[PDB]
């Protein structure tokens, strides 16, 4: 009953990997938006 | 990035800067010295000649030739979001939990606007705090301001943490039967020590209550202006949540005495004449502005409930702080040093405690139909037993009648089982069952304050309840 | 009881008088520092 | 129009330069424009006390002085409305801004869009003086009379015909160019002029037997009540508002806590006027302030309410004014005084607290209006000191100028005795002046019956030690008779149910009949005791039930019941022998 | 038993923070690589004119040694003094007429001032 | 700077029965000792300096008499360190600033002492810091503000006095040093309010920060009843966290005995209200027994002779034995009372003298003395009945 | 003033008990007066003339009709003379200050003339430091045979122990001898009240080789018994006197005898042995079981002697 946390740890790792892999595909658009907004 | 370098005077917490008329009154500024350290401050007074800034921290290392002052924000504002739940802040919105800073959906001025009196509605429903002495005899109603009057060595922090991690709503008792309305807890700490900070962090982490709580923690060595700003930020977050996402919010203020002392220090630093007992003359207005932000609003499903906590300086109820707090709020919960010394926890004293909105939060469609009669009968019986216990010392036990002995035994069992619940989480039904079991010790005809129907329906149970949860 | 009440009211009057004297002295020092900073020109 | 710029900002105090010529107590717009008040003038510099928060202001922003002191708008449209401390309608503020009161909002006290049925009562070429009646406007069953401002004289040049108009329409134009509208403004700190103030020789019927008999208040008098928790003050005030002589009721909150004010705001609209089928709010004006509202509004709410009451009585009606808590107003006054660094007098209060209380309370009275008609203001202001101590300076100052004091007690309410006015502590000073009116309109012996009842109650209260030490059964026949007569009095004359259909209101005739019945029964019982009859036999007579049910008898059917009970009282003793 | 949800939430928050930090790093690199672009002289022209017009009157104008060739023309046009200072980078500093007030228009300061505001917009757009 | 702050788990043994038992202070906590002049603050602080279990002791003589410093300097070298056995002065750092020394140096002395304590903590030791009086520091701040012509807050003190006191007191605690070791600082500061008024702002400011409070009483000092600690006016917030250590190192049922003693004292204090009204003789037998037990506890357990060669130091086990004896005697006495034995007969039982003299028994003879006293207590009631 | 003169007249060390050698050095008295009246000054002069102490006394007289600002410098000059004598010529100095209340009045006048921030009741905030600069000038220095002893005298306004002057003086000095008005009204002289009095350096000069070995325990037992008698006095004032237990009567009688004999001694000179004998005779009024603060050896050696046997 002491090993319950391992499955939640691996699920959290999978969720973090999914989030980072989803976000990596759209970095350039956000960077371009920030550059467009900052520059006068 | 505007920069002002015409500083001509530094003394204590105040510094004067020249040719800075663009600074709005009450704005937030930061002072940068020669070594590059950046420390903040607030504009106190601005005129055509110079502006006056009160420094948050100490003024060691400042000089009139190398320091500079820049503007940060025109008006003190905080960025709020629905994802603040589960985070800790230092009292000025800076995270201290090591997690990334939140993304603010919108920024709001912490000095919130007063509620329109014609927009409020009558509080109607209760909050199950899990403590029998509070749930039964001093019921807390959604939208009430019910402070806790504590002492010097009394365990106010333990009670605050227990209420925070035990409080919940009971929609099934009202007939809805669904947990449609979310529940959230906002915790504000002012002038706490390191030990109290560690205790609060451990208590919130160990039970999972952090997932529904927002903590604003202000240490004792932090700048006093942060202590001033902490309750306003906490109440701003609470109001935003309740009145924009239909949340039920319970706000706990750890120590209003520290807030009053900080307010006195700030007032004295600005060279103002104090009022009664050396306290600022506008203390009543400030406390009212803090307290009156809680309530329920017509057309909104959310609510805000406040439980201020203050330590009476010399156990005096005539001190300005508790006097004004009771003059603004709608009751109080009194902690007794005698009960604490007798090993009873939580040491809540029913006799001087009072709730002015209890009659609205109980009835037949909510809690149970016998709540008020049981509560008042318990109050009267406990008062009678306590009074008899004083006379039994001098006149002896044998000189008492049978009713006096029954009352004495009832009072002793009440103190042993009802108040001294330890760390248990008693629901309202369990507390009512314990109360009825205690009342069953008295004779059938001695319950003058209860209708015969409730007596017939509930009388006769024996004491087998507290033993079910050691 | 009446003796205790009389003692209580006497003590209260003494404390109030001391508070009023302190307030007056504070106002006096504020007025005089204002006078000095005004006449220094 | 005096205009200046901000020179210096420090807290709620704003210093403005270039304000030469500004009058001493004008109202100013500070900022882009927050409402302020000039409190000091020095050269080209004026000191302004801003009512609201000053955060965000900057040096150099405009300052405009309106050129007039604090004033209220008097005219049609005030009834059935709710206002803050400085006469801002809360309903339209909620409509405009939502659930919060945003700073810098501006609204008009009287609605400028509503149309009223004008009805002139003056003709061209007629001389008009201050206080004369110009026309008539219906308002919720009242005849609202348009009055000339008190400081206006002239003769009428033209008058508009009857029709629909707004309050801004110049209905009457004088020959000097003056235009008279349906409303006018009056400073709240100046009492409205009167022709003459009359003596207090008429009673203010409250509808409660204890207040109407034992501790009366004259029409135009002043009364004060405590406000302890659990004593049922709110229901007493509501019953007073429902069953009073006043045609118009003005209610002032002046800084009460939020939930109590919410209860008051949600209870009055559900009350029903006894004289008709409509709600009581059609002849009620509400002034509400929470403890977190600006202090200036809380301080000026009392004056605003009393000025509105003065206007309504100047129209020729009877007005009852209820100040909910003068202690909160005193606290606000203390805070404002401390803002000016004034020397405190006693327990932090300013030295002029008594003067301000007297100035507020002395606006009450029955006067001959400038129009020659009679009007009055009755003030019932409650004091709720922290801790209930009567040595607190506000209570001492109040008790030196009021004419009556109705001490509400929580102990009586604990034993389910209502309306729970303690008769031992209460007193009144209007009995001697009202005695001729009682003789004329009630009965020639009414003062004697009242004194007899008071003496019986005093004797009953004098025996409380023995009945507590040894119990009632250890007394003699006379002592037991006194105790039982006092109990009958308490349970049948002083007690009154406000929620009962017929027992809610009691006229003077019914109270006189009940007192006479009680006194006659006491005389018969004492005679029977003198004739050797046992006390237990007396305490079991059936006419006691008829006496007990007297207060539940209808007003029109009362005389027959009273005659039958009077006959039965003499029959029960003499016939049994 | 429910702590796994809290750990999942913390992991998601850490991932979001890492993504925001990566966006910050990319924007920082793009800004610091600006002086190698043909738009760089126009950007410093805009910064110089904005700094000179923010102050009603500037006693002197401070520019980076590499920036002064692209702004000397309007430095002479506006009639303000030009002074060189190696420490300044990606911007210009204008000193007030009285010498007590100075304004800084470096791109780093602008990024610091605007990122806290555009964080919500970029978070909404990215996810 | 330090790496991390730790939770206090071990107690700070001061060698005094009342402080070690009723109002314990943990290693890394803070305590305050307010009282009027002549109550015994300086003697108590010297007793802690002599008998505490800290590795290094730093004593700050802020604005007090010089004769105290002379006494410390003369007497400490001739004493022995309880830990290592060497001279006691070898573990003491003394900072002296007498009354007639310049006023502005008191703040400097306080800061120097606390900084030296922090450094010795950084070295990995356990340091106990004792300030002679922070009231003199407050008075020095008031004098400096008066020279500065500031606006006083209350009683002439500058506004920032509370902030400075909080900053000074927050330096204490048990930490993990930057070098990876573990150390702690324990701060005990005495307060001397003018006229003995406990509402003085310095005392109120201190009361809201320290975790333990040891209030002194003038009436007990007048009776020459030392340490003269007001039981009713004192408290401690470290009791709950130190329970496992007490269970492990002293006895399994030590908290129960302490709770029983506290409950008995509370009941005696409650009965004193009736005693002062109707006299002691108007009570029943049980109430008289409770009063007598309270008197025995006050005179034989709480009391301690600081100038006695044996009573000056008292270990935890000795106090545990004494309180166990007192509780056993109370139980037997109430059992006998239930059997109709007169209260006057019980008060003359010879075991009371043994209980009273048990305080003077040396640390070596106590283990057998406790057994003999327990056997005598059992015999005086069970065998007699 | 009478107590001060008696102390100055009768003071002497006891080298025989300490075994320090019969040096027998007379005391040198430095007398400083501040705002003293003619009556008190004449009394002091007459006493010193009678005792022949003017041949070895230095007087600094500031009469009540002298300017009030001169009181600032008088104690400093007196203490400078005392320090010079003691630490440069091995003298033994007994310094008497007539009234510190007048000095505090002058200090408050100067502070109010300069508009200092006051302490309590208008006194300047630096009064503690100013008084410390005067009191802390006495003591003994290592390597020198001299000594400076200070006996300040001050009158508490309205007998208030919480007044700033006596409060600060107690916070600075090493104890105090407090006089009781009730004892004075009962004819007891000297009216020294033992319970509020205190001597901080008491235990440094009493013990085995100094005075007698039973000194400290007898003192503690006397204090305890007197406190018990005082409490029983309140008990008697509250309830009937006939309800007292015999132990209460014994304590009450002990308190009365203590007040009448130990305190009220008149103008006579008592050696330490006589005082200890009287104390033991008074303690003999209680049973041996009640002497819990005295070791059994001293009780066996000394208990039992009769009070009436001392004089008769
Ligand atoms: N624990 C104690 N045991 C014995 N005597 C004590 C004790 N505490 C104080 N005293 C006595 O009481 C006196 C009180 O003086 P002191 O401790 O210096 O007081 P304070 O610190 O308040 O100035 C001591 O000089 C000593 O004679
Ligand atoms: Mg000391």
């Amino acid at each position: 009953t002491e090993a319950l946390l391992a499955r939640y740890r691996e699920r959290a790792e999978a969720e973090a990997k999914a989030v980072r892999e989803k976000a990596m595909a759209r970095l350039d658009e956000a960077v371009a938006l920030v550059l467009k907004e900052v520059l006068p | 990035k505007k920069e002002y370098t015409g500083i001509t005077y530094i003394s204590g917490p105040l510094l004067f800067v020249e040719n800075a008329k663009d600074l709005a009154y009450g704005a937030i500024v930061d002072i940068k010295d020669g070594t590059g350290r950046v420390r903040g401050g607030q504009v106190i007074e601005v005129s055509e000649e110079y502006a006056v800034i009160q420094v948050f921290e100490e003024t060691t290392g400042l000089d009139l030739a190398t320091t500079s002052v820049s503007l940060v924000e025109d008006v003190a504002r905080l960025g709020v979001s629905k994802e603040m739940l589960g985070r800790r802040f230092n009292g000025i919105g800076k995270p201290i939990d090591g997690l990334p800073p939140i993304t603010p959906e919108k920024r709001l001025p912490i000095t919130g606007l007063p509620l329109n009196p014609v927009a409020r509605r009558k509080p109607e429903q209760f909050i199950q705090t899990g403590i029998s002495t509070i749930d039964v005899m001093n019921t807390l109603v959604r939208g009430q301001k019910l402070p806790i009057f504590s002492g010097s060595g009394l365990p106010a922090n333990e009670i605050a943490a227990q209420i925070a991690r035990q409080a919940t709503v009971r929609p099934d008792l009202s007939g809805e039967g669904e947990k449609e309305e979310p529940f959230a807890v906002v915790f504000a700490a002012m002038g706490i020590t390191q030990r109290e900070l560690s205790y609060f962090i451990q208590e919130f982490e160990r039970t999972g209550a952090l997932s529904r709580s927002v903590l604003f923690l202000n240490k004792a060595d932090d700048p006093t202006i942060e202590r001033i700003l902490t309750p306003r930020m906490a109440l701003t977050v609470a109001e935003y949540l309740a009145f924009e996402h239909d949340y039920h919010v319970l706000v706990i203020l750890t120590d209003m005495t520290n807030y009053c002392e900080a307010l006195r220090e700030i007032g004295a630093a600005r060279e103002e004449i104090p009022g009664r007992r050396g306290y600022p003359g506008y203390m009543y207005t400030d406390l009212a502005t803090i307290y009156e932000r809680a309530g329920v609003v017509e057309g909104k499903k959310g609510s805000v409930t406040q439980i201020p906590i203050l330590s009476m300086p010399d156990d005096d109820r005539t001190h300005p702080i508790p006097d004004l707090t009771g003059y603004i709020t709608e009751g109080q919960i009194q902690l007794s040093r005698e009960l604490h010394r007798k090993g009873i926890y939580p040491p809540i004293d029913p006799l001087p405690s009072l709730s002015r909105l209890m009659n609205n939060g109980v009835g037949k469609g909510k809690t149970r139909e016998d709540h008020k009669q049981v509560s008042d009968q318990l109050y009267s019986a406990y008062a009678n037993g306590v009074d008899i216990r004083k006379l039994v010392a001098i006149i002896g036990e044998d000189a008492l009648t049978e009713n006096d002995r029954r009352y004495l035994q009832f009072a002793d069992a009440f103190e042993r089982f009802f108040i001294n619940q330890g760390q248990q989480n008693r629901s309202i039904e369990e507390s009512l069952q314990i109360a009825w079991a205690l009342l069953s010790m008295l004779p059938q005809g001695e319950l003058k304050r209860i209708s015969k129907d409730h007596i017939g329906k509930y009388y006769g149970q024996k004491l087998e309840e507290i033993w079910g949860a050691p | 009881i009446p003796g205790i009440r009389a003692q209580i009211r006497f003590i209260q009057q003494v404390l109030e008088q001391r508070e009023r004297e302190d307030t007056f002295r504070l106002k006096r020092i504020k007025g005089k520092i204002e006078a000095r900073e005004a006449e220094e020109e | 129009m005096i205009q200046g710029v901000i020179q210096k900002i420090a807290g709620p105090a704003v210093i403005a330069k270039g304000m030469l010529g500004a009058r001493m107590y004008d109202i100013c717009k500070v900022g882009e424009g927050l409402v302020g008040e000039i409190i000091r003038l020095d050269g080209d510099t004026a000191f302004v006390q801003v009512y609201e928060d000053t955060s965000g202001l900057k040096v150099g922003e405009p300052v405009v002085s309106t050129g007039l002191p604090l004033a209220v708008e008097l005219g049609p449209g005030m009834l059935n409305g709710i206002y803050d401390g400085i006469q801002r309608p809360l309903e339209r503020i909620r409509e405009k801004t939502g659930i919060y009161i945003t700073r810098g909002v501006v609204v008009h006290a009287l609605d400028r869009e509503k149309k009223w049925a004008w009805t002139p009562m003056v003709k061209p070429g007629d001389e008009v003086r201050g206080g004369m009646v110009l026309g008539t406007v219906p308002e919720f069953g009242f005849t609202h009379k348009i009055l000339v401002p008190p400081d206006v004289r002239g003769r009428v040049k033209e008058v508009k015909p009857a029709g629909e108009y707004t309050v801004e329409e110049p209905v009457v134009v004088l020959e000097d160019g003056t235009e008279l509208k349906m409303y006018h403004t009056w400073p709240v700190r100046r009492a409205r002029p009167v022709q003459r103030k009359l003596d207090p020789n008429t009673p203010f019927l409250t509808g409660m037997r204890i207040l109407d008999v034992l501790f009366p208040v004259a029409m135009g008098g002043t009364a004060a009540i405590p406000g302890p928790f659990g004593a049922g003050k709110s229901v007493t005030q509501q019953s007073l508002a429902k069953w009073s002589n006043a045609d118009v009721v003005v209610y002032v909150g002046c800084g009460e806590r939020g939930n109590e004010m919410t209860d008051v705001l949600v209870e009055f609209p559900e009350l029903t006027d006894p004289k008709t089928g409509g709600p009581l709010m059609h002849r009620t004006v509400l002034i509400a302030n929470t403890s977190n509202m600006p202090v200036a509004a809380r301080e000026a709410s009392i004056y605003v309410g009393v000025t509105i009451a003065e206007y309504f009585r100047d129209q020729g009606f009877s007005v009852a004014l209820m100040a909910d808590s003068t202690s909160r107003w005193a606290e606000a006054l203390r805070e404002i005084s401390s803002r000016l660094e004034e020397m405190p007098a006693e327990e932090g209060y300013p030295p002029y607290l008594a003067a301000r209380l007297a100035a507020f309370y002395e606006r009450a009275g029955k006067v001959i209006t400038l129009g020659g008609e009679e009007g009055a203001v009755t003030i019932v202001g409650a004091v709720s000191p922290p801790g209930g101590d009567m040595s607190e300076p506000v209570t001492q100052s109040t008790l030196r100028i009021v004419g009556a004091f109705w001490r509400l007690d929580a102990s009586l309410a604990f034993r389910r005795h209502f309306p729970a006015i303690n008769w031992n502590g209460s007193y009144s000073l209007f009995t001697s002046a009202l005695d001729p009116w009682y003789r004329e309109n009630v009965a020639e012996d009414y003062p004697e019956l009242r004194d007899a009842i008071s003496e019986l109650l005093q004797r009953e209260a004098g025996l409380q030690e023995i009945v507590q030490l040894v119990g009632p059964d250890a007394l003699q026949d006379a002592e037991r008779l006194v105790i039982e007569v006092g109990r009958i009095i308490r349970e049948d004359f002083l007690q009154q149910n406000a929620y009962h259909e017929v027992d809610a209101y009691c006229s003077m005739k019914k109270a006189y009949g009940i007192m006479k019945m009680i006194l006659a029964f006491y005389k018969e019982a004492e005679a029977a005791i003198k004739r050797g009859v046992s006390i237990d036999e007396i305490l079991q007579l059936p006419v006691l039930e008829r006496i007990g049910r007297a207060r539940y008898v209808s007003e029109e059917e009362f005389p027959a019941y009273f005659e039958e009970a009077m006959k039965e009282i003499q029959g029960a003793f003499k016939a049994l022998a | 038993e429910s702590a796994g949800e809290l750990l999942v939430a913390t992991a998601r928050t850490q991932a979001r923070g890492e993504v925001l930090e990566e966006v910050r790093r990319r924007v920082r690199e793009a800004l610091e690589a600006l002086p190698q672009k043909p738009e760089w002289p126009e950007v410093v022209r805009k910064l110089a004119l904005e700094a000179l017009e923010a102050l009603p009157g500037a006693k002197a104008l401070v520019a980076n040694p590499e920036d002064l060739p692209h702004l000397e023309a309007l430095a002479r046009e506006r009639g303000v003094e030009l002074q060189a200072e190696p420490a300044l980078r990606l911007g210009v500093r204008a000193v007030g007429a009285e010498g007590k007030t100075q304004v800084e228009n470096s791109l780093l300061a602008r990024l610091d001032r605007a990122w806290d505001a555009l964080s919500s917009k970029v978070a909404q757009a990215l996810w």
Side-chain angles (χ1 to χ4, degrees), chain D residues 295-312:
Chain D
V295 64
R298 279 143 55 203
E299 187 258 325
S301 56
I302 295 297
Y303 297 117
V304 163
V306 73
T307 302
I308 290 172
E310 284 194 291
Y311 167 63
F312 265 113

Side-chain angles (χ1 to χ4, degrees), chain D residues 51-321:
Chain D
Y51 288 174
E52 299 153 287
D53 188 17
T54 43
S55 55
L57 289 186
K58 293 164 74 169
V59 176
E61 292 184 310
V63 173
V64 182
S65 172
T66 69
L68 295 172
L70 179 65
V72 287
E73 298 188 346
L74 303 170
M78 287 190 290
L79 292 183
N80 205 72
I82 303 173
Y83 299 108
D84 67 339
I86 56 178
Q87 212 196 13
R88 290 150 70 223
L90 292 178
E91 300 271 20
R92 303 177 217 139
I93 291 176
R94 178 193 177 199
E95 289 173 14
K96 289 188 69 162
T97 81
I99 71 179
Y100 296 111
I101 303 183
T102 64
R103 83 174 188 183
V105 72
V106 63
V107 294
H108 296 300
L110 305 185
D111 195 356
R112 301 305 201 257
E113 311 301 327
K114 192 170 189 296
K115 311 198 88 83
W116 306 92
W118 167 247
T119 298
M121 284 172 55
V122 72
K123 298 175 176 65
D126 292 351
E127 308 291 324
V128 290
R129 297 291 171 265
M132 286 186 173
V133 184
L134 296 176
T136 296
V137 160
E139 179 175 29
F140 294 121
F142 283 166
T143 294
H144 200 105
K145 315 185 192 189
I146 305 300
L147 305 177
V148 189
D151 289 334
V152 169
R153 296 177 55 171
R155 69 201 312 266
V156 177
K157 178 160 63 81
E158 63 182 285
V159 63
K160 303 210 175 202
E164 317 297 288
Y165 304 92
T166 56
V167 302
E168 282 289 340
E169 199 76 33
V171 291
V172 168
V173 186
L174 301 186
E175 288 211 65
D176 59 355
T178 312
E179 296 167 346
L180 300 179
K181 309 174 175 75
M182 288 192 178
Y183 80 103
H184 69 285
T185 51
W186 188 257
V188 306
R189 288 195 163 80
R190 276 182 57 208
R192 295 182 62 89
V194 292
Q195 280 193 24
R196 195 169 72 257
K197 191 158 288 199
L198 302 184
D199 291 331
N201 55 345
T202 51
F204 177 78
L205 306 177
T206 318
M208 277 174 270
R209 286 184 292 264
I210 185 167
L211 301 180
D212 284 345
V213 172
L214 293 186
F215 315 105
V217 60
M219 174 74 82
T222 55
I225 62 182
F229 170 71
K233 180 169 63 70
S234 58
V235 56
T236 298
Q237 279 174 335
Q238 289 173 10
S239 58
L240 195 147
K242 276 172 64 177
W243 305 99
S244 291
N245 292 138
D247 308 295
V248 177
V249 173
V250 179
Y251 193 94
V252 178
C254 60
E256 202 174 38
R257 70 191 83 199
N259 288 321
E260 293 192 314
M261 186 54 59
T262 306
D263 300 324
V264 176
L265 286 172
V266 306
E267 277 179 359
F268 291 167
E270 300 295 326
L271 300 190
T272 55
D273 187 15
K275 312 172 193 178
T276 184
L280 188 66
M281 280 292 290
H282 294 289
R283 58 197 188 87
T284 301
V285 186
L286 288 181
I287 288 149
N289 300 277
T290 55
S291 67
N292 68 332
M293 288 188 80
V295 64
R298 279 143 55 203
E299 187 258 325
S301 56
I302 295 297
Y303 297 117
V304 163
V306 73
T307 302
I308 290 172
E310 284 194 291
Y311 167 63
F312 265 113
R313 58 89 171 169
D314 280 340
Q315 287 199 45
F317 300 126
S318 175
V319 179
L321 169 64

Side-chain angles (χ1 to χ4, degrees), chain B residues 21-204:
Chain B
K21 59 158 57 174
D22 284 334
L23 299 176
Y25 160 76
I28 308 298
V29 297
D30 47 353
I31 301 107
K32 180 170 179 282
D33 61 350
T35 79
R37 175 181 168 189
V38 173
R39 61 177 65 87
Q42 180 178 41
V43 174
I44 291 316
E45 183 178 1
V46 57
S47 74
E48 293 174 313
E49 309 165 47
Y50 53 85
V52 181
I53 296 89
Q54 183 167 24
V55 189
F56 291 165
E57 304 86 354
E58 79 293 330
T59 59
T60 305
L62 292 181
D63 64 72
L64 304 184
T66 74
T67 60
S68 74
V69 176
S70 173
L71 173 67
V72 170
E73 200 177 26
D74 275 329
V75 177
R77 278 179 280 239
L78 172 70
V80 299
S81 174
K82 202 170 177 285
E83 69 191 9
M84 299 183 93
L85 295 162
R87 305 294 308 273
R88 309 205 296 270
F89 305 102
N90 73 331
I92 57 166
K94 307 296 187 284
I96 55 172
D97 52 357
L99 299 183
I102 69 158
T103 181
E105 167 173 46
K106 65 178 70 175
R107 298 178 61 77
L108 306 175
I110 67 189
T111 303
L113 314 172
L115 284 174
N116 202 330
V118 301
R120 308 169 86 110
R121 64 175 162 96
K122 206 156 161 57
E124 207 75 34
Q125 299 205 348
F126 77 106
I127 290 186
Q128 181 189 281
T129 62
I131 300 177
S132 49
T133 304
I134 297 175
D135 280 354
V136 170
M137 304 182 74
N138 305 277
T139 313
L140 175 63
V141 184
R142 293 212 286 264
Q144 193 179 8
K145 297 145 279 170
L146 185 62
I148 290 176
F149 286 176
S150 176
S152 55
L154 307 187
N157 292 345
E158 282 69 31
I159 302 172
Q162 181 168 8
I163 293 172
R165 76 177 151 76
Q166 284 183 190
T168 191
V169 289
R170 294 297 302 275
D172 49 332
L173 301 183
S174 82
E176 301 188 342
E178 60 193 320
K179 196 65 71 71
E180 176 163 47
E181 303 104 346
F183 191 84
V185 173
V186 180
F187 197 92
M190 291 166 281
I192 64 170
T193 62
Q194 178 63 36
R195 169 179 43 78
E196 299 169 278
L197 172 63
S198 305
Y199 178 83
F200 281 137
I201 288 166
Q202 287 287 338
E203 282 293 300
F204 269 88

Side-chain angles (χ1 to χ4, degrees), chain D residues 520-532:
Chain D
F521 184 91
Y522 167 61
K523 283 186 190 293
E524 296 305 319
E526 187 170 84
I529 284 297
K530 198 67 62 174
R531 293 193 297 103

Side-chain angles (χ1 to χ4, degrees), chain D residues 492 510 514 517 545-554 558 561:
Chain D
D492 297 335
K510 171 186 266 179
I514 291 167
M517 287 193 293
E545 193 267 0
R546 273 86 191 159
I547 295 177
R549 302 309 297 181
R551 69 173 162 129
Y552 295 96
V553 182
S554 310
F558 183 75
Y561 187 101

